[PDB]
Design a protein around this ligand. Structure first.
Ligand code: ZN
Length: 273
DNA sequence: TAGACCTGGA
DNA sequence: TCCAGGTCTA
């Protein structure tokens, strides 16, 4: 899940939990809880608080309670669902927040990579993991100027730059490869070798891609679905991600898949330079 | 940067 | 065995 997916999850989840009061918190896999470290302290402090809001920061879900904020990262497979406490639990459900109305927020995560941090509302943003987080791609905080200032200060791939949450927030493997394709830039090329026109083109593409992905409800390429188990529709507008060995939608040239920044990387050998 | 941190699907 | 919408590390 990246900005689009998390944003979609956030939108479909909020109305289902807003106003509900946490009566209990069950943890079936303690490692997911990062702060406080003690899974029992994490549970105990949630008890009694009401969900007042659900915000997003980068790829993080920020559950706003009474005095605390629950910072949740779905990582690769984290998923939330709201269901009746009387129904059996689905597999890989590691954390369940029981509400006083008998319903419950269930956190499923097959790979168990997700993380949860609870801090007093005020502390949340100045503490990790939200502390060291780049600006929102859909806000004036993210400008070609910002991307430029970071590109010139590094010799690493423009892909590694974009995948860096400190540079810009919310971009993952799918949207980085897609934005770079749409900007006509090879992902493996040095970030500092990007010209002012390219950087202003990339920025424009990134912002455009993220926005469209948000409208289409995110990209369902493997296991992603919004809170209602509904798949997104942006995967049908993907140019390169996961299309290796398939003709490029623009030029017909077979899409390539290599490894860049340690990640599977897709691109058109002809349309990107 | 090759692995962790985990687990299921091709 | 190879791979994965995330992210740190030796
Ligand atoms: Zn092409």
């Amino acid at each position: 899940p990246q900005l689009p997916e998390v944003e979609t999850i956030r939108r479909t989840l909020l109305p289902l939990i807003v106003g509900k009061t946490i009566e209990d918190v069950r943890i079936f896999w303690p490692n997911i809880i990062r702060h406080p470290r003690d899974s029992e302290a994490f549970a105990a402090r949630m008890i009694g608080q009401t969900v007042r809001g659900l915000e997003r920061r980068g790829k993080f879900l920020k559950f706003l309670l009474d005095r605390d904020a629950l910072i949740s990262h779905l990582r690769m497979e984290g998923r939330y669902a709201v269901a009746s406490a009387l129904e059996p639990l689905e597999p890989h459900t590691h954390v369940v927040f029981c509400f006083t109305d008998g319903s419950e927020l269930r956190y499923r995560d097959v790979r168990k990579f997700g993380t949860m941090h609870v801090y007093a509302k005020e502390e949340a943003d100045r503490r990790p993991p939200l502390a060291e987080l780049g600006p929102e791609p859909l806000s004036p905080a993210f400008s070609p100027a910002v991307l430029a200032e970071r590109a010139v200060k590094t010799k690493r791939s423009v892909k590694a730059l974009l995948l860096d949450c400190t540079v810009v927030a919310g971009f993952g493997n799918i949207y980085v490869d897609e934005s770079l394709f749409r900007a006509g830039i090879l992902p493996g090329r040095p970030a500092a070798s990007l010209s002012s026109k390219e950087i202003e083109r990339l920025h424009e593409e990134m912002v455009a891609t993220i926005g469209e992905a948000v409208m289409k409800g995110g990209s369902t390429v493997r296991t992603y679905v919004n809170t209602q188990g509904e798949a997104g529709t942006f995967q049908h507008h993907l140019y390169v991600y996961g299309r290796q060995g398939n003709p490029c939608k623009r030029c017909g040239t077979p899409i390539e898949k290599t490894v860049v920044a340690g990640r599977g990387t897709h691109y058109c050998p002809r349309c990107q330079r």
